[PDB]
């Protein structure tokens, strides 16, 4: 390379009462090469050289205080935890950070559709030990019990997708952290905001379908179990045409029930 | 004599989005977007160099107020809005580079 700069004598607006200036220039000299300076005046010569490394390091414009703590992700608005897969704090980031999205909130469904008592989909605010269960009114009285099979099946699936969504697994992850123009940055944030909006929709569509299925499966399991011994009493209830003690309902809900035992007894009450 | 089949419910649930629904109430949900911050940069695990009253170019050229920055290293240099120069007036044609 070669850099020729001509000194320009002329007064410029006074800065710290100086009408003069110094224009700074730089030159990188490669291991083989030689630095050659020719000057007949006005040169601001070097005193030596600087070490010039690859990358990884950076600069940030921020007025946020530095504090004694450990956080992997830095933004000009202070450090942020990298739990969640996305963030809305700042498009400027230094560590292993969540991606920047326009959205300030993306709610990931981690449950089932809310259909409450107050206004088969019989939403019970009273069932808090499981996502799906049974309510009976027999000879002995009333009672409620949750089905832990359908519940654990729903929990396990939400656990699976949740972990995959928030990293915390062993991989090359689903939403890999960003490391790190205007137009390019806006193009990026629009495509990433689209991704986040679609992913959450897809994920939640699956979770609703998931939980709706588990409920339908448990109702049909009961239907195939009771068979002719009961009738689909409109809503989410069945009408068992015999008497069942707290042990008979237990046998239905715990799966150890058969139509042959209560066969003739059910055939009697039905034809009346 | 009457066996009912239901599910869990909450008085007020969280409204979410699916493929067929833009507003759908669910029992439980979680956040996927970090909106909040303490308002402070953490020292660990990165080397932070607080420029203070100095700009990186001022620390590079060697402005007296920036003598403390000599031969210093960093993972991230933190440049302050209130930083100023206090040596010979200068201009860097192609400063950002």
């Amino acid at each position: 390379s070669q850099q020729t700069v001509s000194p320009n004598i002329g007064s410029r607006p006074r800065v710290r009462n100086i009408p003069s200036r110094i224009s700074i220039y730089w030159t990188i000299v490669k291991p083989g090469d030689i630095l050659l300076i020719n000057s007949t005046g006005n040169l601001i010569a070097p005193r030596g050289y600087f070490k010039i490394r690859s990358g990884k390091s950076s600069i940030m414009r921020s007025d946020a205080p530095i504090g004694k703590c450990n956080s992997e992700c830095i933004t000009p608005n202070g450090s942020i935890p990298n739990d969640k897969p996305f963030q809305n704090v700042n498009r400027i980031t230094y560590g292993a950070c969540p991606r920047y999205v326009k959205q300030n909130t993306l709610k990931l469904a981690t449950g089932m559709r809310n259909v409450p008592e107050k206004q088969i989909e019989n939403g019970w605010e009273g069932m808090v030990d499981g996502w799906y269960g049974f309510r009976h009114q027999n000879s002995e009285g009333r009672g409620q019990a949750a089905d832990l099979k359908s519940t654990q099946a729903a929990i396990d699936q939400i656990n699976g997708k949740l972990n995959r969504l928030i990293g915390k697994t062993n991989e090359k992850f689903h939403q890999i952290e960003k490391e790190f123009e205007k137009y390019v940055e806006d193009t990026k944030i629009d495509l990433w905001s689209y991704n986040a909006e679609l992913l959450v929709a897809l994920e939640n569509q699956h979770t609703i379908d998931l939980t709706d299925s588990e409920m339908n499966k448990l109702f049909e399991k009961t239907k195939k179990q009771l068979r002719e011994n009961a009738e689909d009493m409109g809503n989410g209830c069945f009408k068992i045409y015999h008497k069942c003690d707290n042990a008979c309902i237990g046998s239905i809900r715990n799966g150890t029930y058969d139509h042959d035992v209560y066969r003739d007894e059910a055939l009697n009450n039905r034809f009346q | 004599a009457t066996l009912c089949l239901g599910h869990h419910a909450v008085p007020n649930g969280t409204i979410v989005k699916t493929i067929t629904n833009d507003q759908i109430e669910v029992t439980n949900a979680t956040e996927l977007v970090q909106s909040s911050s303490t308002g402070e940069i953490c020292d660990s695990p990165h080397q932070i160099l607080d420029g203070k009253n100095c700009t990186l170019i001022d620390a590079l050229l060697g402005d007296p107020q920036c003598d403390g920055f000599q031969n210093k290293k960093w993972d991230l240099f933190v440049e302050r809005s209130k930083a100023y120069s206090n040596c010979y007036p200068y201009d860097v044609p192609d400063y950002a580079s």
Partner: antibody
Amino acid sequence: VQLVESGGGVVQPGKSPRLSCAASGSSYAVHWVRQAPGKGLEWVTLISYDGANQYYADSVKGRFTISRDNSKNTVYLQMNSLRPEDTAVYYCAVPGPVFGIFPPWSYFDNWGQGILVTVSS
Amino acid sequence: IVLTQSPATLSVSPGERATLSCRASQVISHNLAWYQQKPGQAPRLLIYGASTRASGIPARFSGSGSGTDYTLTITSLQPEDFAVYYCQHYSNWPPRLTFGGGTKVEIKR
């Protein structure tokens, strides 16, 4: 939601000591996790929120009994058919919620102070 | 299902990072919880659902894993973190509850 335990001290095999775990005013399910001296944690039993279901480990199956008096807001670990392998610090625990629901089998977000029993004669 | 914790003891100096492993005999679908037990007192819940950190627990405790291989990380270990740690499995349909052997986070000297 502090938990308080009682019924410790030294006990001679043949006796049937009763371990009590009281609350602070509704009701969840209650588990019992024991720790032998110098050894690690071992899950022994649990009782449902209502009491309909009770689960015991193979170690204490047929020897230990779990009951609950909602009226007194307590759970009772009735331990009979003693073995000197029951010398442990007994901790009662409350299962934590998962995705809004509180099923009996889970992590423990609430623990009792710990009560030591000594099967020795 | 059986939980195997490694190492039985881990020698760490303050400032350093600790990596506590929990191996399950078969897939536990992230139903794991981590506890800190100081001498004399009851175990303290740190993480649940393998990755979810308990209310008020310092940010340095990081729970991860999948399949049968799970991990507990303490990014910048404080002198108050030297204790015994136990991983815990739990399940409602196949009813199960197991605790690992435990690992001692000992002061490196």
